[PDB]
């Protein structure tokens, strides 16, 4: 130790690999021929949606981090809040309070925009295949 | 060799990636300065953010002056014929009132920073016009436009 | 009378209401993605 | 090193995993309701 815990951690990214390795062995059957192959074309759609996904989800991650918590030191932990905190405000909350009301409702039409877009790429694509 | 560097930079394909590295740079530095604390005067990273818009403003003014129509009242309406172009200028004007308020002391300084926060929510949906250059974001951005006439248009019922 | 039955009816009508709104919002786009 | 980055990567990969499973379970039935 601490090298022994590090080598075990690299084992944990091995076991996450050997299950998606099996997908090649899956395609031998009549249904997993098409089913595994469309994971390949959805792979060129699901890290490929995310160009416009980070446009809409992270923009609220930096906008909320300036209205709320306005006295943050320049550090890397602020960048950790732009992709993890928007995934964790599912239960979260002149016109000083109207500005959070507008961005929350615009987030209501934003996460519905992203969910409707992610169920848009596949609808045509399952039909000619 | 001087002809090589001249003809390389003058190509429209080359000018795309040469300015969008500056655009994604403006997006990330403006993310930086809102996280950095505010003072009476802007810092080094805030001073390059403000000058990026002021050089953009003279660039927008040469779009009116070096336009196809000749009459002055004629070269106003045709420049505002684009839905993207009309909402560009109100964001520049919101940045300007945000600069005057931020230069003043508190509580005006917090108010000017709040108008910066509605600027940064704009510059990401500004990029969607720049997205449509690719084979998939041509249709994908355009259907955001027709879903826009469906998602504040569902909300009646 | 049924003082608590009135919250029971409006809660269940809300159960078929937020399912009505979710099913309607996934209704506008289904035809529209196909001719485009 | 990034001791907390490893939970961040697996949580976000889980975000695209449970969306992958939900989108797959609403994929099997879409064609199948139409010829029936
Ligand atoms: C600051 C700041 C913003 C910005 N970007 C634009 O606002 C935009 C643009 C977007 C992406 C890449 C390149 C340019 N842009 C500014 C120059 C005039 C102009 C003309 C037509 C279309 C876009 C455009 N550059 O600096």
Give the 3-state secondary structure of residue A27: coil
Please indicate the experimental technique that yielded this structure.
cryo-EM
Distance from the first to the final alpha carbon of chain D:
56
Distance CA A88, CA A57 (A): 12
Q: Which DSSP state fits A2?
A: -
Q: Which DSSP state fits A122?
A: T
- Asked whether A and C share 3 or more beta-carbon pairs under 8 angstroms, the answer is yes
Please check whether residue A61 is in contact with residue A82, taking contact to mean a CB–CB distance below 8 angstroms: yes
Give the 3-state secondary structure of chain D.
CCCCHHHHHHHHHHHHHHHHHHHHHCCCCCCHHHHC
Q: Which DSSP state fits B157?
A: -
Please check whether residue B68 is in contact with residue B77, taking contact to mean a CB–CB distance below 8 angstroms: no
Distance CA B115, CA B112 (A): 5
Q: Which DSSP state fits B71?
A: S
Q: Which of B89, B67, B63, B84 is nearest to B132 (CA)?
A: B84
Mutate which of B29, B130, B131, B134 to test ligand 1's pocket (most atoms within 8 Å of Cβ)? B130
Structure tokens at A73: 């030191």
C30 reaches A (C-beta below 8 A): yes
Structure tokens at A100: 């959070």
For B64-81, letters b (16+ CB in 10 Å) and e give eeeeeeeeeeebeeebee
For residue D35, what are the CA distances in angstroms to A90, D29, D30, D31, D32?
A: 39, 11, 10, 7, 6
DSSP A38-83: HHHHHHHHHTTSHHHHHHHHHHHHHHHHHHS-----S-HHHHTTTT
A15 reaches D (C-beta below 8 A): no
The Å distance, Cα B12 to ligand 1 centre, comes to 14
Please check whether residue A54 is in contact with residue A61, taking contact to mean a CB–CB distance below 8 angstroms: no
Please check whether residue A69 is in contact with residue A41, taking contact to mean a CB–CB distance below 8 angstroms: no
Please check whether residue A62 is in contact with residue B31, taking contact to mean a CB–CB distance below 8 angstroms: yes
Structure tokens at B5: 């560097």
Q: Which of D16, D14, D12, D30 is nearest to A39 (CA)?
A: D16
C-alpha Rg value of chain A to the nearest Å: 21
Which residues does chain A break after (C to N > 2.5 Å)? 93
Return the axis-axis angle of helices A3-26 and A32-46, rounded to nearest 10°.
130
DSSP B1-45: -HHHHHHHHTSHHHHHHHHHHHHHHHHHHHHHHHHSPP-SS--HH
Element (H, E) at A111: helix A98-118
Residues 81..120 of A with a Cβ closer than 8 Å to C: which?
112, 116, 119-120
Distance CA B28, CA B24 (A): 6
Give the 3-state secondary structure of residue A34: helix
Taking CB atoms and an 8 Å limit, are C33 and A123 in contact across chains? Answer: yes
- Within 13 Å, how many C-alpha atoms sit on residue A26's CB side? 15
- Residues B41/B47/B49/B50 CA torsion (nearest 10 deg): 70
Resolution in units of Å: 6.7
For residue B53, what are the CA distances in angstroms to B22, B67, B91, C4, D21?
A: 12, 21, 10, 60, 44
Q: Which of A52, A59, A81 is nearest to B117 (CA)?
A: A59
For A86-121, letters b (16+ CB in 10 Å) and e give beeeeeeeeeeeebeeebeeebeebebbbebbbbbb
For residue B152, what are the CA distances in angstroms to A1, A118, B5, B145, B147?
A: 58, 19, 49, 11, 9
Cβ burial, residue B44 (10 Å; 0-12/13-18/19+): exposed
Angle at B118 between CA B113 and CA B123, to 5 degrees: 115
Please check whether residue B141 is in contact with residue B129, taking contact to mean a CB–CB distance below 8 angstroms: yes
Please check whether residue B105 is in contact with residue B40, taking contact to mean a CB–CB distance below 8 angstroms: yes
Distance CA B47, CA B32 (A): 12
Q: Is the CB of B59 under 6 A from ligand 1?
A: yes
Structure tokens at A22: 């099996």
For D7-23, letters b (16+ CB in 10 Å) and e give eeeeeeeeeeeeebeeb
């Amino acid at each position: 130790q601490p090298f022994r815990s590090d080598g075990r951690v690299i084992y944990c990214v091995n076991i996450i690999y050997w299950y998606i390795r099996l997908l090649d062995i899956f395609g031998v059957n009549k249904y997993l021929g098409p089913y595994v192959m469309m994971i390949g074309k959805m792979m060129i759609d699901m890290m490929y949606f995310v160009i416009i996904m980070l446009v809409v989800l992270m923009s609220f991650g930096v906008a909320r981090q300036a209205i709320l918590f306005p006295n943050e030191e320049p550090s890397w932990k602020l960048a950790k809040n732009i992709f993890y905190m928007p995934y964790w405000m599912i239960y979260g909350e002149t016109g000083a309070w109207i500005v959070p009301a507008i961005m929350a409702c615009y987030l209501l039409v934003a996460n519905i925009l992203l969910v409707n877009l992610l169920i848009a790429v596949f609808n045509n694509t399952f039909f000619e295949v | 060799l001087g002809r090589k560097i001249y003809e390389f930079y003058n190509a429209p394909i080359v000018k795309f990636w040469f300015y969008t590295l500056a655009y994604i740079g403006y997006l990330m530095l403006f993310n930086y300065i809102v996280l950095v604390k505010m003072e009476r005067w802007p810092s080094t990273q805030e001073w390059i953010v403000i000058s990026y818009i002021f050089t953009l403003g003279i660039e927008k003014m040469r779009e009116i002056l070096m336009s196809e129509p000749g009459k002055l009242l004629q070269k106003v309406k045709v420049w505002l014929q684009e839905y993207w172009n009309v909402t560009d200028l109100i964001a520049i004007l919101l940045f300007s009132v945000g600069m005057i308020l931020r230069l003043q002391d508190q509580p005006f300084r917090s108010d000017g920073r709040v108008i910066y926060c509605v600027n940064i929510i704009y510059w990401y949906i500004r990029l969607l016009d720049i997205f449509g250059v690719n084979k998939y974001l041509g249709p994908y951005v355009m259907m955001i436009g027709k879903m826009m006439i469906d998602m504040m248009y569902f909300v009646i019922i």
